[PDB]
């Protein structure tokens, strides 16, 4: 999987 940095607010890492 890959890590993405997106704002969910707050900016966090997300594993896809």
- 14's contact among Na ion, Cl ion, a second copy, none, with CB below 5 to 8 A by partner kind, is a second copy
Instruction: Check if the beta carbon of residue 14 is closer than 8 Å to that of residue 1.
Output: no
Contact residues for 12 (Cβ-Cβ < 8 A; gap 6+): 5, 6
Is residue 2 a contact point for a second copy (CB under 8 A)?
A: yes
Is residue 10 a contact point for a second copy (CB under 8 A)?
A: no
Q: Which helix (H) or strand (E) holds 13?
A: strand 11-15
Considering the complex, state which of residue 1 and residue 10 has its C-beta at the smaller distance from Cl ion: 1
Is residue 1 a contact point for a second copy (CB under 8 A)?
A: yes
């Amino acid at each position: 999987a890959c890590v993405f940095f997106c704002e969910d607010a707050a900016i966090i890492g997300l594993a896809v």
